[PDB]
Amino acid sequence: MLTYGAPFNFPRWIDEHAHLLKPPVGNRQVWQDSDFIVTVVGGPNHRTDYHDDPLEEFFYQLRGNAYLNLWVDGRRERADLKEGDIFLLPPHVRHSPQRPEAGSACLVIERQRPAGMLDGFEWYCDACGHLVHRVEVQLKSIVTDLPPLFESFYASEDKRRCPHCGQVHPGRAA
Ligand SMILES: Nc1cccc(C(=O)O)c1O
Ligand SMILES: [Fe+2]
Ligand SMILES: [Fe+2]
């Protein structure tokens, strides 16, 4: 049986869910309980956290523009996601997506993580570049498992404190 339903028009789905593709929500998963996690992410959203995904991530920037702050080969880099761009990110490449434009929409496709395969979320010092805090997580649900992780970081000056130069990470903003 067609567990995930029949085909449907994508642009229409996006327009009908436009109020969810903006703060405070920002994103929407298309299908529930599937092996492929298919999400549409909108904007605006800026963030400071870097994601360490143990599996690949596919991006297709449908509307608007965005960029990914990355660490590549020990250096900070940027991959620009201009409207119409596609991109495949290898596992473990640290990335922090920035989505400045309202009304933007990006297709992001991931896989469910098997038991034991953990996601990491990291923050780095604006001053010296050292890792400030890393949390690893078994990701079952984005909505429940993720926000409190970000919240405890922002609320603790200890977690935000660089172990190399003592500068305290700004937390939420930058
Ligand atoms: N962490 C993460 C995983 C998959 C997609 C995004 C996105 O907002 O581009 C993201 O920020
Ligand atoms: Fe990610
Ligand atoms: Fe530092």
Q: DSSP assignment of 18-57, as one string?
A: TTTSSTTT-EEESSSS-SEEEEEE-S-B----EEE-SS-E
Please choose, from the candidates 93, 139, 94, the residue with its C-alpha nearest in 3D space to the C-alpha of residue 114: 139
Which of 30, 51, 68, 135 has most ligand 1 atoms within 8 Å of CB, for mutation?
A: 51
Torsion sign across C-alpha atoms 131, 98, 141, 55: negative
Give the whole-angstrom CA distance, residue 1 versus residue 19.
31
Give the whole-angstrom CA distance, residue 66 versus residue 78.
10
Q: Do the annotations mark residue 106 as ligand-binding?
A: no
Instruction: Write phi, then psi, for 8 (nearest 5 degrees).
Output: -150, 160
Return the structure tokens found at 169.
Answer: 């990470």
Residue that the structure tokens 């143990």 belong to: 54
Return the structure tokens found at 102.
Answer: 């309202």
Give the whole-angstrom CA distance, residue 46 versus residue 68.
10
Domains annotated for the chain, with CATH where assigned, are 9-174 (2.60.120.10)
Which of 22, 95, 96, 119 has most ligand 1 atoms within 8 Å of CB, for mutation?
A: 95
| CA-to-CA dists, residue 117 to 54, 98, 132, angstroms | 7, 26, 22
Method for structure elucidation = X-ray
* Amino acid identity at 2: L
Return the structure tokens found at 138.
Answer: 């078994």
Please choose, from the candidates 67, 69, 141, the residue with its C-alpha nearest in 3D space to the C-alpha of residue 104: 67
| Ligand 1: nearest atom to the Cα of 108 | 5
| Ligand 1: nearest atom to the Cα of 39 | 5
Give the whole-angstrom CA distance, residue 130 versus residue 23.
30
| Ligand 1: nearest atom to the Cα of 47 | 11
| Interrupted backbone of the chain, residues before each interruption (C–N > 2.5 Å) | none
Report resolution in angstroms: 2.0
